[PDB]
Design a protein around this nucleic acid. Structure first.
Ligand SMILES: [Mg+2]
Ligand SMILES: [Mg+2]
Ligand SMILES: [Mg+2]
Ligand SMILES: [Mg+2]
Ligand SMILES: [Mg+2]
Ligand SMILES: [Mg+2]
Ligand SMILES: [Mg+2]
Ligand SMILES: [Mg+2]
Ligand SMILES: [Mg+2]
Ligand SMILES: [Mg+2]
Ligand SMILES: [Mg+2]
Ligand SMILES: [Mg+2]
Ligand SMILES: [Mg+2]
Ligand SMILES: [Mg+2]
Lengths: 63, 127, 226, 25, 97, 50
RNA sequence: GGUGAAAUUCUUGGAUUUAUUGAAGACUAACUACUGCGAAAGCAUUUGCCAAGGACGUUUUCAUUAAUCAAGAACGAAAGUUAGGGGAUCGAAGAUGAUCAGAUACCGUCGUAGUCUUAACCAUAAACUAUGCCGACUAGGGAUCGGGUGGUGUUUUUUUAAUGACCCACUCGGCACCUUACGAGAAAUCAAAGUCUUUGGGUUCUGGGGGGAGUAUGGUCGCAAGGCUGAAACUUAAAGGAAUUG
């Protein structure tokens, strides 16, 4: 069960029709400078540390 | 120094076809489609579904031995939508990151010289 | 779409690659790069004769891989496997092509496209169809912004292009012509006959397709792969 | 009702009349 | 009452214009009345280059671009996050944004 | 319009064939009357698709 | 495969997919545009032949031959009819799957006529610019197509000329456009929809409250479908147009 740790640089905004999910773009701690935008459910800041069971999807970024 | 193949990926709506082929094109390796991975029939073309199919074709290459592969993205073509599906690109990023060597990326979707007739009738698909 | 296969058999395991052996494609003479790549054929049994099973393949390559210089990036080439021997199956020229991106990038509106084609035959009776394309150009100091042709230039230019293509094939058998498309000498040559008519920028010729080929004549092919 | 369809409704009707009058002449 | 001086299109002295099919719903529509927009995009992604660069021989290969012309019918174009609706005075602005 | 002594169709209280008029290719002389070894019947619709 | 989501449908007899090759029919992409032509319907691959047309140039010719037009004639999208050819794709009818309270509908899968061509009909359309045609005059400005004129102008040949492509200025005709309202209008809006109570340049057609009704009948044309011509009884005080605020 490979597990990757990602850190938040900044939070992009809130998405979803309901408005509970926020759009956050992060980077992998190990193998830095590799960054990804993913969707998170709970309250967030910068510098948060997320746990991703998978680290390979590009989430839907509202644009 | 690297053995080639042709990715021959089929970006489309409602599915995703990815399969490396020998440079001639006659001999085929690891034809895996996007519907093989999700038992929902609704995520047939979903990016995650396409991603899984690309890995297995990439994974199945090592056993054969081919290491590098040319890329040919290709939409529905013909008198159809002519625009690659959402699972179209997530497979490509999956193919490159899984280790194979990419070269000669190109678009090969068939464009007609004002072909026969498009389905939908005069007033189109009223909804 | 996994657990929905209602039925498999209407009337009612070995790895395929266990007997697959790689070959090598051998490009013709007038290409600096020689190792085209590899192919797959299953093992030739006593009855299958898989040696004959691959004489018909058509392999796909680009001049950038044949001349090694990105200036020929698009420059698509189709090679036809002609005869196989000693793991070094030999190919020959089948037809040139343009990439999709290049062909669409050249076509911008506010100008006039001119296209032409001919069905000349070579000295060695190879029958070829050469397509030729062009676009008009805005003269420097131009104020008006479209620069369309007068639709009698397009008639006149098309006549000149067709004569040039006929000249450049006849008297040239197959390979000098192959070594004439690589330097794009014909592209530069046509521009000599159109500047007195109209600017005609961007004269990259087009795909050229092969229609009918003469008798095999093992010897002629042997010359290419010296 | 729509003008197109009322004109069509008449046309079918004039077929019935043009036929029943033929039973007489 | 007349809504437009061209009334839908850019046909002045044409007689007829040989329609084209809407690429979203196949609704037939004259070429000049359509909502032609050009779609050019990187062949891969605006972000995949960070991965398709390393995973490619021939460094900095070409990053080629796909090309397509998109005709939209008024019904689809208005619905599809496009030209939708402007003020009565703003209807006269032909300058693209 | 013939009698049953005359033709496979002949006879009846109404003028009717009685059995399918499509005869097999393997029938014998005297049994082959009507349409012989027909693949299809009825009015032709669409292209022949030969 | 299809879809918002599924089901019918084709699938171990190898579908969808990949390669090479072949056939058939239709279409003429991107270029393609406040661009071109035509009396109008209409017309966009290449070349050849056949005849035509405008605009321009003109110190050529005839000399009022003209403008508009009942009757009358030609052409006349699509669909539709008749008979051969053709018959890919799409697809009135029809058959199916789903949705729904129902769904003989919209969505999906099939699919006949039709779609194409030949010979002959039909004679209509939001056939629209909803703006009859000819003529004169009334404000500016940018841009474009065709032809012409001048500029030691730029460019390419043979540094060099002529031409061709450009640039500047002007002009004749066309497709249009932008600002203004002196003027017009019920107003939206109009360089014509102005020069109309200070009401007359020539001329053809049409209209007269809303329904009944473009109906009945009678002619006439048509293979038919249907076209053209076309009332009366009766019933009613409002139908309507353009803008304003909700
Ligand atoms: Mg309105
Ligand atoms: Mg019209
Ligand atoms: Mg198969
Ligand atoms: Mg033009
Ligand atoms: Mg064309
Ligand atoms: Mg009428
Ligand atoms: Mg009218
Ligand atoms: Mg006048
Ligand atoms: Mg002008
Ligand atoms: Mg001029
Ligand atoms: Mg014009
Ligand atoms: Mg009155
Ligand atoms: Mg009245
Ligand atoms: Mg009103």
């Amino acid at each position: 069960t490979p597990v990757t740790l990602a850190k938040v640089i900044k939070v992009l905004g809130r998405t979803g029709s309901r408005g509970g999910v926020t759009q956050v773009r992060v980077e992998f701690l190990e193998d830095t400078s590799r960054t990804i935008v993913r969707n998170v459910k709970g309250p967030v800041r910068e510098n948060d540390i997320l746990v991703l069971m998978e680290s390979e999807r590009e989430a839907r970024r509202l644009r | 120094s690297q053995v080639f193949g042709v990715a021959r990926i089929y970006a489309s709506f409602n599915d995703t076809f990815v399969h490396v082929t020998d440079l001639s094109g006659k001999e085929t390796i690891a034809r895996v489609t996007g519907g093989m991975k999700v038992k929902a029939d609704r995520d047939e073309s979903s990016p995650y579904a396409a991603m899984l199919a690309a890995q297995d074709v990439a994974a199945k290459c090592k056993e054969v031995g081919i290491t590098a592969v040319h890329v040919k993205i290709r939409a529905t073509g013909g008198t159809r939508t002519k625009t690659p599906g959402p699972g179209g690109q997530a497979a490509l990023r999956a193919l490159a990151r899984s280790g194979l060597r990419i070269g000669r990326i190109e678009d090969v979707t068939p464009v007609p010289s004002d072909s026969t007739r498009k389905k939908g009738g005069r007033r189109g698909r009223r909804l | 779409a996994v657990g929905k296969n209602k039925r498999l058999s209407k009337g009612k395991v070995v790895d395929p690659f266990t007997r697959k052996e790689w070959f090598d494609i051998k490009a013709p003479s007038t290409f600096e790069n020689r190792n085209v790549g590899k192919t797959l054929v299953n093992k030739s049994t006593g009855l299958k004769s898989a040696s004959d099973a691959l004489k018909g393949r058509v392999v796909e390559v680009c001049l950038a891989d044949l001349q090694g210089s990105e200036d020929h990036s698009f420059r698509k080439i189709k090679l036809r496997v002609d005869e196989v021997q000693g793991k070094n199956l030999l190919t020959n020229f089948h037809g040139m092509d343009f990439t999709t991106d290049k062909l669409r990038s050249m076509v911008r509106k506010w100008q006039t496209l001119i296209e032409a084609n001919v069905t000349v035959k070579t000295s060695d009776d190879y029958v070829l169809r050469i397509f030729a394309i062009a676009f008009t150009r805005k003269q420097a100091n131009q104020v008006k912004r479209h620069s369309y042709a007068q639709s009698s230039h397009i008639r006149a230019i098309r006549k000149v292009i067709s004569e040039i293509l006929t000249k450049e094939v006849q008297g040239s058998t197959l390979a000098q012509l192959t070594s004439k498309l690589i330097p794009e000498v014909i592209n530069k040559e046509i521009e000599n006959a159109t500047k007195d008519i109209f600017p005609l920028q961007n004269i990259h010729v087009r795909k050229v397709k092969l229609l009918k080929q003469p008798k095999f004549d093992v010897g002629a092919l042997m010359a290419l792969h010296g | 009702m729509r003008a197109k369809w009322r004109k069509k409704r008449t046309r079918r009707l004039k077929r019935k009349r043009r036929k029943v009058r033929a039973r007489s002449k | 009452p007349k809504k437009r001086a061209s009334n839908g299109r850019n046909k002045k002295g044409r007689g007829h214009v040989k329609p084209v099919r809407c690429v979203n719903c196949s609704k037939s529509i004259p070429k000049d009345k359509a909502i032609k927009r050009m779609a050019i995009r990187n062949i891969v992604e605006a972000a995949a280059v960070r991965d398709l660069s390393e995973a490619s021989v021939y460094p900095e290969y070409a990053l080629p671009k796909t090309y397509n012309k998109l005709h939209y019918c008024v019904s689809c174009a208005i619905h599809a996050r496009i030209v939708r609706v402007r003020s009565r005075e703003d209807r006269k602005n032909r300058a693209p944004p | 319009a013939m009698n049953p002594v005359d033709h496979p169709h002949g006879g009846g209280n109404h003028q009717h064939i009685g059995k399918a008029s499509t005869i097999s290719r393997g029938a014998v002389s005297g049994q082959k009357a009507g349409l012989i070894a027909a693949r299809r019947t009825g009015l032709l619709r669409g292209s022949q698709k030969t």
